Design a protein around this ligand. Structure first.
Ligand SMILES: C[C@H](Oc1ccc(C#N)cc1)C(N)=O
Ligand SMILES: [Zn+2]
Ligand SMILES: [Zn+2]
Ligand SMILES: [Zn+2]
Length: 585
């Protein structure tokens, strides 16, 4: 027994064909079975024909006959159909409202999550369907990982380099950092974990969590997990206050945080607030400074990734009493300078998926573009806070959507928080970029920030762009543009100072070729998010939707503190770069 996801109506039915088995009320369960292919229904029992060796599961072809369920062929003389009178038969038949359109719930329940429109719907439907969609999508995502063939160590060629043998009659996953494997040792009667791993084309290059002397027979699967059901909304109800509530501001603050004092007061004057921090504007500075502005306030600092939490820890370590901090870790190497797993500590740093059930004066949720509605609900379920602060940038990269192929996902659809920031705007905006030369700040200000992002630094005169299509080659799941790497090689010979530069591209295969030919450190745009480097060399590689994505392009060029070279494929983004154009040698 549970709650209809459409009505909330109390009910004893769950759709058995829906992978999450939502509870549906007699009405909603009917409207759902008669208007989709979903025909298996679960109660306290499953509406299936309890006749010996009959295969009838369709609820519309079954009858209660006694206290058992039968099809037409096997039913007793005295029976009533399970599925008639615009209603499906179960407990609480007299408390049931329904809905005018079940259309959104069917779409969410049936879609394969390959189309953008599926994520658009999942983020614009009612709040209870946002939770159903977020569970359905995440279960569809964790199941898809099982579709992928086992990789097995056939030969250990070197250290850091392997020969894999793949399971037959199943696809092989892409070999980039968005697909993290787990190794396993061949035992007496079972297997035991042996750290997590990633792979890249050679033979294959492997950069595993821990070191080992792994040998033939060791194999790898993308580790999936149980998706738990959601209960809490993606956002609590907003409340605006006329005074700061449940927070006591400091009388003496330092001029390091004095630029945020007005924003800190705003945080205390509503239930949740959104902070848009463009690249190098001071998001973590903001977050730690909030502690010093409300010194008595218990603050839980959270984010999706261990890296995002550890970077809050690194900033705390520099401003907060260490004795007053704790890093929560579940039973991967992260921050090890606080007492571990001290929930009652005044400053708690913890990933979403590891959060304890606790209360706080303020919850700070960082790198919000990377959050899903699933993460948003989990935070609200674990943390009851006087105030919630969501810090991020909807102009930066979202969580990868491994099933999406048809369509692009616009920032207003990344999650509920990003939707607010792109429709009503953010509560707070960090308007000064301290990282990047003015040429890069002017470019991204016009590209994605409605000309509101201002440069601290002057022009560097070291921001350059080349329009060169080159030649595009494709491997199993990535792109290469050798001529664009050639152009960079010629550029380095004439400009040898740029040999301390970081190589960035949209493709891991472009990066592997560049690493060998140039010897620069490489990062995918996606892996560079949150990092900064003095000099950046960027090859667009292709003009695809992936390489032309404005959020990706915005992250790519805002990695640079001093100088950047962009080898561009797309005439559009080339023309938008406020960089010195260079001829082709
Ligand atoms: C003025 C210019 O400075 C650079 C210094 C470092 C890099 C890199 N990478 C590029 C350029 C020079 N050294 O010619
Ligand atoms: Zn269903
Ligand atoms: Zn219902
Ligand atoms: Zn039967």
């Amino acid at each position: 027994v549970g709650a209809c996801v459409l009505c909330n109506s109390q009910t004893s039915l769950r759709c058995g064909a829906c992978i999450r088995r939502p509870f549906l009320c007699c009405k909603c369960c009917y409207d759902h079975v008669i208007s989709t292919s979903h025909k298996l229904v679960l109660s306290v029992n499953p509406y299936v024909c309890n006749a010996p060796g009959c295969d009838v599961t369709d609820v519309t072809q079954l009858y209660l006959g006694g206290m058992s369920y039968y099809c037409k062929s096997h039913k007793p003389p005295i029976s009533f159909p399970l599925c008639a009178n615009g209603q499906v038969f179960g407990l609480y038949k007299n408390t049931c409202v329904g809905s005018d359109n079940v259309t959104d719930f069917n779409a969410i329940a049936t879609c394969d999550w390959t189309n953008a429109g599926d994520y658009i719907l999942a983020n614009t439907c009612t709040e209870r369907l946002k939770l159903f969609a977020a569970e359905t999508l995440k279960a569809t995502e964790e199941t898809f990982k099982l579709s992928y063939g086992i990789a097995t160590v056939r030969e250990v060629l070197s250290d850091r380099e392997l020969h894999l043998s793949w399971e037959v009659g199943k696809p092989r996953p892409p070999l980039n950092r968005n697909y993290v494997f787990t190794g396993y040792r061949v035992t007496k009667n079972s297997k035991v974990q042996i750290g997590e791993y990633t792979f890249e084309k050679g033979a294959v290059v492997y950069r595993g969590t821990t070191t080992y002397k792994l040998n033939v027979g060791d194999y790898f699967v993308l580790t999936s997990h149980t998706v738990m059901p959601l209960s809490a909304p993606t956002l609590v109800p907003q409340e605006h206050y006329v005074r700061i509530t449940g927070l006591y501001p400091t009388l003496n603050i330092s001029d390091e945080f004095s630029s945020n004092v007005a924003n800190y007061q705003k945080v205390g004057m509503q239930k949740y607030s959104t902070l848009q921090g463009p690249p190098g504007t001071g998001k973590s500075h903001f977050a730690i400074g909030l502690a010093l502005y409300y010194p008595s306030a218990r603050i839980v600092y959270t984010a999706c990734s261990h890296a995002a939490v550890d970077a809050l820890c690194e900033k705390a370590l520099k401003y907060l009493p260490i004795d007053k901090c704790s890093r929560i870790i579940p039973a991967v190497e992260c921050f090890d300078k606080f007492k571990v797993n001290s929930t009652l500590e005044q400053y708690v740093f913890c990933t979403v998926n590891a959060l304890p059930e606790t209360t706080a004066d303020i919850v700070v949720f960082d790198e919000i573009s990377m959050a899903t509605n699933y993460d948003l609900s989990v935070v609200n379920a674990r943390l009851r806070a006087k105030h919630y602060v969501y810090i991020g940038d909807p102009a930066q990269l979202p969580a990868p959507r491994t099933l999406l192929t048809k369509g692009t996902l616009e920032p207003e659809y990344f999650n509920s928080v990003c939707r607010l920031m792109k429709t009503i705007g953010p509560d707070m905006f960090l308007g000064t970029c301290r990282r990047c030369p003015a040429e890069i700040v002017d470019t991204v200000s016009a590209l994605v920030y409605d000309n509101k992002l201002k440069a601290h630094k002057d022009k560097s005169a070291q921001c350059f762009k080349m329009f060169y299509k080159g030649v595009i080659t494709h491997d199993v799941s990535s792109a290469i543009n050798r001529p664009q790497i050639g152009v960079v090689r010629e550029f380095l010979t004439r400009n040898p100072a740029w040999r301390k530069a970081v190589f960035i591209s949209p493709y891991n295969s472009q990066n592997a070729v560049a690493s060998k030919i140039l010897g620069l450190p490489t990062q995918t745009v996606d892996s560079s998010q949150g990092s900064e480097y003095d000099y950046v060399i960027f090859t667009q590689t292709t003009e695809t939707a992936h390489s032309c994505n404005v959020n990706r392009f915005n992250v790519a060029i805002t990695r640079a503190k001093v100088g950047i070279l962009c080898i561009m494929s797309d005439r559009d983004l080339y023309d938008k770069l406020q960089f010195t154009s260079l001829e082709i040698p």
